[model samples]
Target: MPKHEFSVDMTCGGCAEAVSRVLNKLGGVKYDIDLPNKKVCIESEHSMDTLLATLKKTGKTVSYLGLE
Candidate 1:
């Protein structure tokens, strides 16, 4: 599996918690949300598009370092 780290413009505790909850449900994806750092990191065998789309759907602004 490949690991990806992203900085999310998560403004509150609610978004952070939501991020973890949302990511956990996806198959083949494991994620961590660091509220203190406002960073989200995940390891998955899925495509970056799938991973990021999942994160975006959680309603957070995610910035993937090199995906663009």
Candidate 2:
């Protein structure tokens, strides 16, 4: 599975937690959020489009970095 990376303007613990909850709901996706870097590292069997759309539901700005 490719590890998908995202640039989300997550600024604090609360925001990250919310992001975590959102990401966790997706099947075949697990994540690690780097608060300082505003980076989300995700391993998923799903497509980037689906992944991206799901994250956006959090209402935080999520920019896809693919797997880099």
Candidate 3:
């Protein structure tokens, strides 16, 4: 599994919840959201492009921070 980190402009619980929703739909992903830090750390077998696209569905500012 690849552990990827991302910086997301998540402001509150709802923002994190939205991220979770999209990630769940994408499936095959195990993730942790740090709302206070606006970071999302994911462990998945999916391609980076696919993960990035899935996070973008939340309409939030997202940037990949590379592998962990």
Error of 1 at 48 (Å): 1.2
lDDT values, one for every candidate: 0.78, 0.84, 0.93
Query: Which stretches of model 1 miss by more than 4 angstroms?
Result: 66-68
Best by lDDT: 3
Clashes of each: 0, 0, 0
Clashing pairs in 3: none
For candidate 1, write residues 1-68 as lDDT tens digits: 78888888888889866887778778777777788888888888877787778888876688785421
Local accuracy of candidate 3 as per-residue lDDT tens digits, 1-68: 89999999997788877998999999999999999889999999998899999999999899999998
After superposition, the stretches of candidate 3 with alpha carbons farther than 4 Å from their true spots are none
RMSD of each: 2.7, 1.1, 0.7
lDDT of 3: 0.93
Q: Write the per-residue lDDT of candidate 2 for residues 1-68, one digit (tens) a residue.
A: 78989888887789777887887777678888899998888888888888889888988888888685
**Higher-TM-score candidate among 1 and 2?**
2
Model 2 TM-score on a 0 to 1 scale: 0.88
